[PDB]
């Protein structure tokens, strides 16, 4: 169930410095597999996961075409946007776009997203009924009109349900050893006295995949949402993640603090305290 | 493969 292919697009002006610039990255779930960067010597689509390096040239040539196209349409949209908002040519602005497709346990398209931001704010976004849009402001509302006329939600829906999903699967079969494995965390709890009066412990999840996890310091077996601290899941740098969670407490109150960690490759949501 | 985007 619930696999997905997502692309992430970023393009920006650089008045005073140089030509707009366009960058794209594709993931399958939480594994990035492809990249493209406008500023390259001769921009080309390059791999990022081992398992895609297996496609023949037609794949590279084709996506390199689509990105060279996607390069120019953004140079262009950058410019159109300076028109819809009365913006000067001398300030740099940015476009960001995510689109992707989720597939069922069976593999049909479960959900599909396409989402535009200008300058950090939402711009235009396609709705769950892959036909309509939510337009952030008046500018996006021109776009919305422009796109209803070109029936450009239907073009979108044709891709999602066809080219993406077809490829979503074509990959998953090539990199199944990578992409259909769930790596459960290697978890450890650590001992840190900030004083005799008060001492903190730390729930450690290391080298896990995918990036989804829950580290909950259960006091007496309860969440303690307001007194605990946690860092956002971070990347290891191989294709794996790590998160930690800590809490400050009076000493000798150790064992009643159990750490609940749930993760996709975990049969039992593991509860753990730890001492020497 | 990747989508090609509309203008505007």
């Amino acid at each position, epitope marked *: 169930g619930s696999h997905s292919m997502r692309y992430f697009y970023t393009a920006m002006s650089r008045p005073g410095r140089g030509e707009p610039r366009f960058i794209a990255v594709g993931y399958v779930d939480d594994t990035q597999f492809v990249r493209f960067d406008s500023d390259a010597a001769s921009p080309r689509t390059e791999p990022r996961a081992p398992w895609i390096e297996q496609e023949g040239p037609e794949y590279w040539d084709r996506n390199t075409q689509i990105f060279k196209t996607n390069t120019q349409t953004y140079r262009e949209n950058l410019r159109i946007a300076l028109r819809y908002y009365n913006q000067s040519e001398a300030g740099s602005h940015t476009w960001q776009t995510m689109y992707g497709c989720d597939v069922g346990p069976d593999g049909r398209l479960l959900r599909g997203h396409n989402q535009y931001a200008y300058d950090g704010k939402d711009y235009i976004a396609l709705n769950e009924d892959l036909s309509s849009w939510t337009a952030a402001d008046t500018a996006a509302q021109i776009t919305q009109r422009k796109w209803e006329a070109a029936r450009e939600a*239907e073009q979108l829906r044709a891709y999602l349900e*066809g*080219l993406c999903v077809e490829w979503l699967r074509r990959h998953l079969e090539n990199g199944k050893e990578t992409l259909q494995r769930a790596d459960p965390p290697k978890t450890h709890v650590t001992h840190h006295p900030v004083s005799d009066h008060e001492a903190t412990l730390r729930c450690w999840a290391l080298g896990f995949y995918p990036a989804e996890i829950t580290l909950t310091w259960q006091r007496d077996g309860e969440d303690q949402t307001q007194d605990t601290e946690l860092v956002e899941t971070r990347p290891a740098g191989d294709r794996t993640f790590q998160k930690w969670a800590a809490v400050v407490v009076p000493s000798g109150e150790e064992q009643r603090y159990t750490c609940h960690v749930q993760h996709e490759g975990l049969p039992k949501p593991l509860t753990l305290r730890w001492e020497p | 493969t990747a989508f090609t985007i509309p203008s505007i």
Partner: T-cell receptor
Framework: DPQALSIQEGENATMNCSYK?????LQWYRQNSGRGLVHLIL?????REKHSGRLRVTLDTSKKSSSLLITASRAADTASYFC???????????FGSGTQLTVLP | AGVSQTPSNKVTEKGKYVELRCDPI?????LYWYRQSLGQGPEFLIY????????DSGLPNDRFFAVRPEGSVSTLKIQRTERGDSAVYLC???????????FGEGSRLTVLE
């Protein structure tokens, strides 16, 4: 380069083409006549079937072939008829050979 | 009334320089060029998105080059003209990219020995 069709006026013309390319986002039907220009109707890779006016378009994405059918064909309808596919949703239309239609009285 | 291409006819010999114009629909961002010859499909040439090429894989060779400075009007430049190049060159306009193509009437260009 699917032969010319001559048919009698009022009776139904049916033209076929086939695209080879990976997916298409959509497929188009184009009317090209005398020296002039080229011209239109559109079906998506996710709908089997679409009607406008006297036209009915059909898409089979397993045989990567389509069928345009003109209903009650008239003199005006005499033109060559061309397929276009949008090749990887990547917006360049690819046109096929298509078909010399001649509706005679 | 639509995408005016110009000059509807050009007739020259080997080795000369030809300049095909086309003025597309206002507010259309994509501008395609195609070419076609007696009883064949139009073939792809180049495809502008605003002020520049986003795809030029149709171009058969370095003698072919198109332009569209101000983003509206395009121009097709051919050089060392040859018999081979003889065809109708089609100019189209899309609103956003792909979907419905609005062609101009064309320019019939014959290149003789």
């Amino acid at each position: 380069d699917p032969q010319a069709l001559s048919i009698q006026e009022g009776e139904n013309a049916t033209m076929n083409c086939s695209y080879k390319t990976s997916i298409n986002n959509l497929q188009w039907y184009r009317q090209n006549s005398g020296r002039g220009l080229v011209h239109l109707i559109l079906i998506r890779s996710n709908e089997r079937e679409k009607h406008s006016g006297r036209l009915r378009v059909t898409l089979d994405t397993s045989k990567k072939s389509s069928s345009l059918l003109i209903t009650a064909s008239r003199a005006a309808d005499t033109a060559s008829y061309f397929c276009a596919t949008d090749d990887d949703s990547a917006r360049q239309l690819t046109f096929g050979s298509g078909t010399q239609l001649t509706v005679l009285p | 009334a639509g995408v005016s291409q110009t000059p509807s006819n050009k007739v020259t010999e080997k080795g000369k320089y030809v300049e095909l114009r086309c003025d597309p629909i206002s507010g259309h961002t994509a501008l395609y060029w195609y070419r076609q010859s007696l009883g064949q499909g139009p073939e792809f040439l180049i495809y502008f998105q605003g002020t520049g090429a986003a795809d030029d894989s149709g171009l058969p060779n370095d003698r072919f080059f198109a332009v569209r400075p101000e983003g509206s009007v395009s121009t097709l430049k051919i050089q060392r003209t040859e018999r081979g190049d003889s065809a109708v060159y089609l100019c189209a306009s899309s609103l956003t990219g792909g979907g419905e193509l609005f062609f101009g009437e064309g320019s019939r260009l014959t290149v003789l020995e």
